[PDB]
Symmetry: C2
Subunit: 152 residues, 2 copies
């Protein structure tokens, strides 16, 4: 197992864990000091720690179900063996209170040195897809939970 393969495996594992909906597995993949950065300035860009990530995912689960997250377009993946970083394109989908949701993402992971844990997460998503979901949720009185994390 080269470093490149471990990083690719970590990215797929990251996505599968999220797809499975298992909160304990999510946190077990992260270092204690892991931070998540959402990188669309139309939404909050304040980094979230592991406890805040759990709370945010709970708000998601209140409004969505059948959540899936998977790597797409794998040939465009960028693997940095020296720095233990990987950038990959991903897609996600869910049924929600506001109707079907689909988004596409760019994720960067900072791995630990043995490539077993995630120490940093940067996410880009389509902000219009997300804002449209938030608008549909707000029309159904279901947006305040996600808004308290998402809004500027």
């Amino acid at each position: 197992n080269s470093t490149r393969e471990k990083l690719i495996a970590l990215a797929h594992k990251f996505c599968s864990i999220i797809s499975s909906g298992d909160m304990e597995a999510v946190l077990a993949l992260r270092t204690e000091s892991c931070l998540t950065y959402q990188c669309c300035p139309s939404f909050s860009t304040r980094p979230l720690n592991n406890q805040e990530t759990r709370e945010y995912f709970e708000e998601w689960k209140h409004i969505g179900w059948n959540s899936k997250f998977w790597i797409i377009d794998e040939g465009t993946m960028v693997v940095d063996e020296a720095a233990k970083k990987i950038a990959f394109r991903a897609a996600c989908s869910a049924d929600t209170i506001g109707g079907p949701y689909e988004n596409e993402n760019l994720v960067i992971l900072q791995a630990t040195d043995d490539c077993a844990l995630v120490d940093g997460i940067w996410e880009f998503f389509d902000a219009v897809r997300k804002q449209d979901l938030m608008n549909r949720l707000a029309a159904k009185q279901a947006a305040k939970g996600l808004d308290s994390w998402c809004a500027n």
Copy 2:
């Protein structure tokens, strides 16, 4: 080292974009270079060199003082074996519709000697871009960009 040549290509990419020099922009690309915009709220059809030129000309007709620069340098991902680099960038411009600011993630596929760009993938804040399109449309200045961006 391949690593510094990739990061150098990323810096040159942003410098040349910021200069607005279309000839220099095209000189940095292979003949077969494709540009992929990756926000599905906008067109995701790949653009070749000639289409990219026309697209940038449409930007120049509504905007000026365009800047494009690398940010958060420590977050870059440099893939020496595959000759790829992913980096965060920001951009700004003044426009007919008022000021524009966006933030981006760019992936470059370089040639084997790291001298040319052979593929570009870009993510941007689609709300920032849609808000600009709305402001342009309120000044009847959106038709050119919409023909490249919409759908």
